[PDB]
Structure formats: C-alpha cells, structure tokens
C-alpha cells in the first residue's frame, strides 16, 4: 500500500578508512543523531544558548523587556518550575517583572529559554499545550 524506505541514501558512499572512523552525512547517523546529543542540546538551550560568535537581532531589554512582562500571564495560573527553572525559586510577585538588581540572575536564562520554546516542529507539539498564552509570543517571532 506504499513505498518501502523512500530515503534512498544507498547511492551515497562512506569512506573514512582507518582506526576511529567518523562518518557525517546530511541524513545524520551514528554520532550525528542520538538521545545523549538531544540531552546535551537541552542543557545547551537552557543556559547560555548558542555558542556562535553572533546570534539573532535581540539580546537587549530596550525593545525586549516590555513584551516579556506583557506575555508573563497564565490563564491556568500554573507554569510552576515549568517556566523560570533554577531561578532561586519562582518569585510569588517580583513586583511584576520590572526590577534588574538581584534579578538579572535569571534574565539571561529566560531569554535563552524563549529560543528553546519554539525551535523546530517537535517543540511546537510541546509548545502546542501552552495554546494561546505561548502562541501570542510565537506569532510575534513568526512576524519577525
């Protein structure tokens, strides 16, 4: 009722003859895709995400702080530890996200976490649960 193995990656030949051989193909196999790599990526996205020289158009609070405060509202009144993980505990108030001193500790984690929230189709299924509260933030990112 369908085609069996449509990848058709057989035509590609792998060399690297010798001890400790490492093969890297656009298809991604062996050391390319694995659960440990995904776990490492999760640690990477959570703190100091992106090791590249330069990233996206925005790391400042001049245009990206008011939107974050506006977006910081939960209809279900949940999102405990689910959001600001490892933030010397979720603040009960924090006076509505406008103070920097003794608070910039988690601001870097929060901006890095935002990139992690909507990266590839999979994360969208996870972020699909957030429904409207996250979508609003995702729509602004999509407009770019």
């Amino acid at each position: 009722i369908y085609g069996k193995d449509a990848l058709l990656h057989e035509h590609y030949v792998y060399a690297k003859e010798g001890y400790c051989p490492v093969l890297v193909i656009q298809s991604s196999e062996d050391y390319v895709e694995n659960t440990e790599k995904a776990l490492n990526v999760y640690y990477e996205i959570g703190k100091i995400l992106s090791r590249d020289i330069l990233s996206k158009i925005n790391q400042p609070y001049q245009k990206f702080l008011d939107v974050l405060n506006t977006i910081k509202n939960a209809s279900d009144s949940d999102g405990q530890d689910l959001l600001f993980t490892n933030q010397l505990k979720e603040h009960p108030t924090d006076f509505s996200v406008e103070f920097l001193e003794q608070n910039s500790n988690e601001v870097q984690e929060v901006f890095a976490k935002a990139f992690a929230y909507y990266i590839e189709p999979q994360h969208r299924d996870v972020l699909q649960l957030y429904a409207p509260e996250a979508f609003n933030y995702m729509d602004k990112f999509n407009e770019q």
């Binding site: 659960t35 995904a38 689910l82 189709p121 649960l129």
Partner: protein, 103 residues
C-alpha cells in the same frame, strides 16, 4: 512531516527518547518527556519501538495503550507498552456424571 515508521500515530524520536500523555483541560496531549513539567505530576515516562506498531506485539498499538482507546478490560498494569496483554485460559472440572446405558 514528522516520521512514524511504525505507523502507530506516534513519531519515532518520541518513542526512542521518552514521552508521556497529559490532559490539559479535557484533552489528551502527547508530549515528549520533560522532567521539569511532568515528573512533578507523577507522569510515567514511556519508551517504545520506533518500528513496532505494537512494541509488545500484542494486538494493541503503543498509542492506543498509552491513550486509553482500548478495551478497558485490559488490566491497568498492562497499560504500559513494554507490558504484554494476553489471556491465560485453562479449564477446571468440577464434577463427573456417568450414566449406564443399560435397558
């Protein structure tokens, strides 16, 4: 388009790396495993085959078994995908009746 080689309605990387099912309001959502958004709830992390429609080879998919769209007479400990679900039937004999066919 995310792949599901086992064609059981659940993608392959989730069955490999761990996943769970969680209701939000009245709706079941198939999440991948997050230890900071599930473990607190007591949800059980699930792993199964990316190429077996039924990883335990019983006539029930992985997705039906984690979703609950199954015959409910299946025992709850058999609702895990790595736990097989099958009947064990044996017959006992309580009584004999012999009749002498003598006229």
């Amino acid at each position: 388009t995310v792949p599901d080689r086992d064609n059981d309605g659940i993608p392959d990387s989730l069955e490999v790396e761990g996943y769970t099912v969680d209701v939000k309001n009245k709706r079941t959502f198939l999440s991948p495993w997050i230890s900071n958004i599930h473990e607190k709830k007591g949800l059980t992390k699930y792993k199964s085959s990316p190429e077996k429609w039924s990883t335990a080879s019983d006539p029930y998919s992985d997705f039906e078994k984690v979703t609950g769209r199954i015959d409910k007479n299946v025992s709850p400990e058999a609702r895990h995908p790595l736990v097989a679900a099958y009947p064990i039937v044996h017959v006992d004999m309580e009584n004999i009746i012999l009749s002498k066919n003598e006229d």
